[PDB]
Design a binder for these strands. Structure first.
Lengths: 60, 24, 124, 127, 78, 98, 155
RNA sequence: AACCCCCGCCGUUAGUUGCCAGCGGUUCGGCCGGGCACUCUAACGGGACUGCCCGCGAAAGCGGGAGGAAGGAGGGGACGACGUCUGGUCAGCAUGGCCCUUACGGCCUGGGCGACACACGUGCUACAAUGCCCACUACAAAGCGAUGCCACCCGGCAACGGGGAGCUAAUCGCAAAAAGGUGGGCCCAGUUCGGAUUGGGGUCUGCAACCCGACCCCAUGAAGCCGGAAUCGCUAGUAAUCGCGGAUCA
RNA sequence: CAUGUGGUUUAAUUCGAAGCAACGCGAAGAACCUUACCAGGCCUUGACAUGCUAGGGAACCCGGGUGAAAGCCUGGGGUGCCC
């Protein structure tokens, strides 16, 4: 149940409580950000290539 | 102490308000 | 200072003294001291014949209170031997009645640890 | 008419204004020993003056903002002394000889991942 | 607790109400352990699913506030 | 009378978009309150480096949004002529008020 | 550590007596970083001196602490299949540190309910020449002289 | 190592945050006209190089002194060589090979992941007077917010619930930091210490809180009076202690 | 007392991680969702992709019955084109 699920995520069946998140690149269920629509990995991969405007290597 | 939910710090620690910690 | 059944405190501020009754705590205490108008700071050590009776009057007449309070709570738990709600067991098996981790703690409801045990490795 | 000097210590900032007068000092519209009452220690902020021999000579107006109440007392100590060195180049043979001219760059260091508090590493197991 | 309502399933009541119509006997299967026992529903034995099989629970006045699952254990021996 | 908002992720292209609409705006009539710097709003994104499990050693970034503000004292025809049309935002964003 | 001699951190004087030795003592009183509560006690106890003794508290405390300093002590050492407590001298820095620590601990074992009272009383006793903190001093020095057998391992 | 970011000192540029700093009117609220000198905000710079002096040395450099906000890597970051553990991950994804193709695929309703005679690791609240309880009174930072954070009212013991202003947010909101300060109570007790457990009564999200949610109120107040053999952390704004925010998210 | 694991238990109590360098770890959110596990009811070119054949239907919108839902049975609005 990997493919059947990412497709279940899109539809919104009965009771809106069921509507979970899900990563865009990665079928990722856990660790999924509102701002980017992405997973923790998916994100970090991108951020190094510059495909995310102004998301820079932090340092404080 | 911090687990006595019928006090000042009981409520502060928990993060709540109520009779024993007046709201605002 | 014999208010409820055979219940008696002394040499302490009456707000606190009243506490040593079953079915009287901090709140039901100062609630009563206002409906009888009695300075809480006064010790049981010193106060009117009647102050006491007026106190006893209010308290004893109103809510209950050791014996048949105790006895109510017991027949409550008896009655959860009905067709046998999940909460009814847990009172038969003497385990927690409110959704809790038994695999570790739970010591307050199971009397001291029974170390009955064994598990090995391959000796060679 | 006035003397000015700036003072800051650890997320706390103070503005020092002086006027030759009797003594009285007010801060955030309050007597000194009313804002810092009970903090039996505050009274140290004034020690730069006791090293010039003039404390009966001025009437400072100060406004201090941010951080925490003791850090503030250090900031005042910096501004009081930074005001008077201006109005006397020859008052450098008391200020630099003591610690009253420098800032205190000591600051709360950063909490780091994999620890509890920046340096307290968590408790070891092995078993 | 749900304080405005009584959250009890309909497919249950239909079968109780039309069975209240002269109070028939009662082999009545359900999956609504999440529902209340309603006042008066006495005599009416309801077989409750607990994950595995339908446990024939019988009904009495003293039990009323309590749900159906609250008489249908999901697990075996402690 | 007129309030303008210059928001964006790079400061060197945001300061340049400001300084422009000042030289090319004073000339136009009544004068202007030069670019004034609003506090930056930052957004941290912290997460564990490994795909599986090393719940300690990890890595985190931010996304900073710097702002500036400019106020022109009076609406002349030569001003609203130029600025109303010359919209050259490369990765800069703008809002206008009065 | 292993290269440099380590740093003898410098104290700032007291704001009521201008004595660095007095801040040192307040530090040892202090719990959980609460220096206000700390010095408050110290002084409240100086006040218990004045009442029950027309001596300058400053001078009492000064003597008390001196009377608790131990001249010598024992430090275990390995010789070869035997771990002996060898006796030897004490650093003047070390003398201070200990005497203060012992004073404060001596204080907290007394049966008086509020603190300052304890610290006061214990300081009085010490200067008079006979407190919990002196028994401790005495004890330690008895361990020397007894183990003077092995004093010829002065490391 | 150096170049890159955060904290320290000073300048230049800019004024809806700041300012009786100075006269001005103030229903005394930087509220008001006025004003960038302070404070701050964020952008471009200066500043330190063992360059100066004394001593030791062949040299590199070591010790010591002045000026300085700061020296001898000034305090924190990001950064981790050729390789090691047939280390970890086919369950984030990708991928060779293997095996199943009215089921080892797919949909739902209910259960389970939350079991408990026991055993170990990481933690929280404590056993109290350098303390606990109640009233009043101060001083932060970094962040977050449109079917979101909610000012302010009205009701309720309260959880919450009826109204409803500001807000795209240095212009409104979360918001009170807490320890502290002050004065009132407890008087050494298993206690006004400690808050586990069970009875009774309520609220809010959600289609739904029996197995399994969080809060609020009354009553119950368990074990614990500082811990066998053992065993962890931290060298300075660190340890200790106090509270605040954020991701995920009904 | 909270949480992670061993073990026993169970219809199932899903899988992984194993001295330091696994154990408040994947898990920065398990009541149904999640969800990989079990019991019970159902569905097959399939919940998703690419392309071919064939009459209907060629977009779409609203209900009825049955059931625990899923599913299966079933009543009505009816199409702006190259021409």
């Amino acid at each position: 149940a990997r493919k059947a699920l990412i497709e279940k995520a899109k539809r919104t069946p009965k009771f809106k409580v069921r509507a979970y998140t899900r990563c865009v690149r990665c079928g990722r269920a856990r660790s999924v950000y509102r701002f980017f629509g992405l997973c923790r990995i998916c994100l970090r991969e991108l951020a190094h290539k510059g495909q995310l405007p102004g998301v820079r290597k932090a340092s404080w | 102490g911090k687990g006595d939910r019928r006090t000042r710090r009981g409520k502060i620690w928990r993060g709540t308000y109520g009779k024993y910690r007046p709201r605002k | 200072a014999r208010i409820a059944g055979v219940e008696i405190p002394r040499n302490k501020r009456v707000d606190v003294a009243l506490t040593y009754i079953y079915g009287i705590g901090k709140a039901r205490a100062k609630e009563a001291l206002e409906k009888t108008g009695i300075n809480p700071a006064t010790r049981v050590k010193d106060l009117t014949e009647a102050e006491v009776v007026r106190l006893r009057e209010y308290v004893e007449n109103t809510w209950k209170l050791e014996g048949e309070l105790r006895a109510e709570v017991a027949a409550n738990i008896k009655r959860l031997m009905d067709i046998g709600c999940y909460r009814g067991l847990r009172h038969r098996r003497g385990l927690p009645v409110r959704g809790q981790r038994t695999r570790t703690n739970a010591r307050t409801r199971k009397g001291p640890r029974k170390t009955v045990a064994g598990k090995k490795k391959a000796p060679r | 008419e006035q003397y000015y000097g700036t003072g800051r210590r650890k997320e706390a900032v103070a503005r020092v204004f002086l006027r030759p007068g009797n003594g009285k000092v007010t801060v955030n519209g309050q007597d000194f020993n009313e804002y810092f009452q009970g903090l039996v220690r505050a009274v140290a902020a004034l020690e730069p003056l006791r090293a010039v021999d003039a404390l009966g000579r001025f009437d400072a107006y100060i406004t201090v903002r941010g951080g925490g109440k003791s850090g503030q007392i250090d900031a005042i100590k910096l501004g009081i002394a930074r005001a008077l060195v201006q109005y006397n180049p020859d008052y450098r043979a008391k200020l630099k000889p003591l610690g009253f001219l420098t800032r205190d760059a000591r600051v709360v260091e950063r909490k780091k991942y994999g620890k509890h508090k920046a340096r307290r590493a968590p408790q070891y197991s092995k078993r | 607790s749900l304080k405005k309502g009584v959250f009890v399933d309909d497919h249950l009541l239909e079968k109780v109400l039309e069975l209240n119509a002269k109070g028939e006997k009662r082999l009545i299967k359900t999956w609504s352990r999440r529902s209340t026992i309603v006042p008066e529903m006495v005599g009416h034995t309801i077989a409750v699913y607990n994950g595995k099989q339908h446990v024939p629970v019988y009904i009495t006045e003293n039990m009323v506030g309590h749900k159906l699952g609250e008489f249908a254990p999901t697990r075996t021996y402690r | 009378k007129i309030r303008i908002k210059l928001r964006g992720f790079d400061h060197k292209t945001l300061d340049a978009s400001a300084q422009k609409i000042v030289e090319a705006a004073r000339r136009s009539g009544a004068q202007v309150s030069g670019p004034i710097p609003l506090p930056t709003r930052v957004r941290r994104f912290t997460v564990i480096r490994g795909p599986f499990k090393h719940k300690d050693s990890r890595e985190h970034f931010e996304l900073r949004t710097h702002n500036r503000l400019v106020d022109i004292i009076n609406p002349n025809r030569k001003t609203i002529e130029q600025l109303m049309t010359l919209d050259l935002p490369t990765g800069v964003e703008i809002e206008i008020k009065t | 550590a292993r290269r440099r001699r380590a740093e003898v951190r410098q104290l700032q004087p007291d704001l009521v007596y201008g004595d660095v030795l007095v801040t040192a003592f307040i530090n040892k009183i202090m719990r959980d970083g609460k220096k206000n509560l700390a010095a408050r006690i110290f002084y409240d106890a100086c006040k218990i001196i004045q009442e029950k003794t027309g001596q300058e508290p400053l001078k009492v405390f000064k003597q008390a602490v001196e009377n608790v300093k131990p001249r010598m002590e024992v430090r275990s050492r390995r010789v070869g299949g035997a771990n002996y407590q060898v006796p030897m001298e004490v650093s003047p820095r070390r003398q201070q540190s200990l005497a203060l620590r012992w004073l404060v601990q001596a204080a907290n074992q007394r049966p008086e309910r509020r603190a300052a009272v304890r610290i006061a009383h214990e300081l009085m006793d010490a200067a008079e020449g006979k407190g919990g903190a002196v028994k401790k001093k005495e004890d330690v020095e008895r361990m020397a002289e007894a183990n003077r057998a092995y004093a010829h391992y002065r490391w």
